[PDB]
Design a protein around this ligand. Structure first.
Ligand SMILES: Oc1ccc(C(=Cc2ccccc2)c2ccc(O)cc2)cc1
Ligand SMILES: Oc1ccc(C(=Cc2ccccc2)c2ccc(O)cc2)cc1
Lengths: 233, 10, 240, 10
């Protein structure tokens, strides 16, 4: 039996909030990117460092520790870019038109243009951020969504579904607490979860681009980032 | 054989 | 519009009436056929289904209230997702089998690769529907959500139109809850089931993306012919 | 225009 199912809603919220990984910084050189090499270099370096924090964040998501090591590996391999991306979108909320990869690294469309097949993904990311902003997505909701992504994306057993159910309860708990009517509750829940479809889409497209960058062999990938990427072939 | 395997059991 | 003024039961009846027929393939169990031929059958099948899907989409409440260019974009983005959820739904009562058509049931045994990958995902999704005991009424709701949702964030004042879509999507959510409440589910159960269903759409998007990549490389090999329509639907996704 | 465009129009 898993302790995750025995938590109250508040206990779930508190656990997820305190498990939140920090906001990492990029290199402190003032030259705004442009060119594939410098942009993809900074992003890859950043993603590589975030992954180490994601792994330890994942261990603190209730129910994740109960999975076998192999299952934990599978879920992280499947979900890693989705998780990086929803984090990026979350951070970029209060900077319309901008993607805050790091506090010292904000990109817009025009820099995405300087990498082939990149502006498309940038626009999708920016659109998701605007969507978050117009929905007034809250921090408590965000960490719930992010953990759902971790447990859901690679699931296709009943433990995970039971934990997924409890996160649903938690989301409803937050909306009811925020004063939403019963109709506003299920409507908002649906709106939040449908965005995960688009996040999955953006991840798949991103993965294809990273595979292309991999074959180009100009931007260096870490062995770890390499193995996460390899897991999608 | 996998870095992820190593990092997860820490 | 009429879409916004529909009751939950009217919405359901409308979606049920708009359902496309189940088409047959050209499968002949005497034909030895390889697997450039199997993909030929599926491709032929998909191409004919597309004609029914387009006419079905015009009967999804709120869809025709959209500009033609937005109707095109939505279908270009969601066509494979929609074919796949139809496939998964039809295959519900055939464990380990994918009912592409009444005369075409394939198990994972026959089917190439990255092909078996997608088969397995489609099988698992079908297994998922089965264990959830997905209802036909819930299915038509989910399918229309895919149509309206999948391309909504890749489209001034073309913004107001995004809102009409969101309003219709909200109505379909209302309709889903209405069904679950009528099924006798408690409030906690309705919300949980609603979430369970929508999370599946993330997996259907995933299978679509992977399928689109397989279709793109199958095209470049030029051993099987894609129909004119399928080529154009495929071009909308590009890569890689 | 496109086939899809045409079929939707009809
Ligand atoms: O090697 C990589 C490069 C970029 C990214 C990535 C974004 C991306 C990947 C592929 C295509 C477009 C954007 C990213 C997203 C969120 C972050 O906090 C950090 C990095 C990931 C890995
Ligand atoms: O050219 C095509 C071939 C197969 C398919 C396909 C499934 C598929 C596509 C790519 C890779 C694997 C399966 C399919 C799904 C549902 C249907 O009702 C009919 C066809 C679609 C287009």
């Amino acid at each position: 039996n898993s302790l995750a199912l025995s938590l109250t809603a508040d206990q779930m919220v508190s656990a997820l909030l305190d498990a939140e990984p920090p906001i990492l910084y990029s290199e402190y050189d003032p030259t705004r990117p442009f060119s594939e090499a410098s942009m993809m270099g900074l992003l890859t370096n950043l993603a590589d460092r975030e992954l180490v924090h994601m792994i330890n964040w994942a261990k603190r998501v209730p129910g994740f520790v109960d999975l076998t090591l192999h299952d934990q590996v599978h879920l992280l391999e499947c979900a890693w870019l989705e998780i990086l991306m929803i984090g990026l979108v979350w951070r970029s909320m209060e900077h319309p038109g901008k993607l805050l990869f790091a506090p010292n690294l904000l990109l817009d469309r025009n820099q995405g243009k300087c990498v082939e097949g990149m502006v498309e993904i940038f626009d999708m990311l920016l659109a998701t951020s605007s969507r978050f902003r117009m929905m007034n997505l809250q921090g408590e909701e965000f960490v719930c969504l992010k953990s759902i992504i971790l447990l859901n994306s690679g699931v296709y057993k009943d433990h995970i579904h039971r934990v997924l159910d409890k996160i649903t309860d938690t989301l409803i708990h937050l909306m009811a607490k925020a004063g939403l009517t019963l109709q506003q509750q299920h409507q908002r829940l649906a709106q939040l979860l449908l965005i995960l479809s688009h996040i999955r889409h953006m991840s798949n497209k991103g993965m294809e681009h990273l595979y292309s960058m991999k074959c180009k062999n100009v931007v260096p990938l870490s062995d770890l980032l390499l193995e996460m990427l390899d897991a999608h072939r | 054989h996998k870095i992820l395997h190593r990092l997860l059991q820490d």
